[PDB]
Amino acid sequence: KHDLSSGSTGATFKATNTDQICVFCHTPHNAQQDIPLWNRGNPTASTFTLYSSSSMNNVPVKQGFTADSISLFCMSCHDGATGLGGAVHNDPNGAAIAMVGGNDLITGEANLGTDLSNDHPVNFEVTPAGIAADGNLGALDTGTNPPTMKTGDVTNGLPLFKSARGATTLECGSCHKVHDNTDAPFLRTTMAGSKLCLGCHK
Residues placed in the known binding site for heme c: 1-2, 25-26, 29, 51, 55, 74, 78, 120, 137, 172, 176, 179, 197, 200-201
Site string for a second copy, 42-61 (x = CB under 8 A): ---------xxxxx------
Asked if 151 and 174 touch (Cβ cutoff 8 Å), the reply is: no
CA torsion sign, 37 to 41 to 42 to 44? positive
What is residue 179's three-state secondary structure?
coil
Partner from a second copy, ligand HEC, none contacting 173, C-beta within 5 to 8 A by type:
ligand HEC
The closest alpha carbon to 137, from 146, 124, 145, belongs to 124
Q: After which residues is the chain broken (C to N over 2.5 A)?
A: none
Minimum CB separation from a second copy for residue 192, in Å? 4
d(CA 43, CA 71): 11
Is 50 among the residues that bind ligand HEC (CB under 6 A)? no
Is 29 among the residues that bind ligand HEC (CB under 6 A)? yes
Minimum CB separation from a second copy for residue 83, in Å? 21
Report CA 58 to chain centroid distance, whole Å.
19
Residues that bind a second copy in the complex, under the rule CB under 8 A: 5, 7, 18-22, 28-32, 34-37, 51-55, 109, 112, 117-120, 145-146, 175, 191-194, 197-198
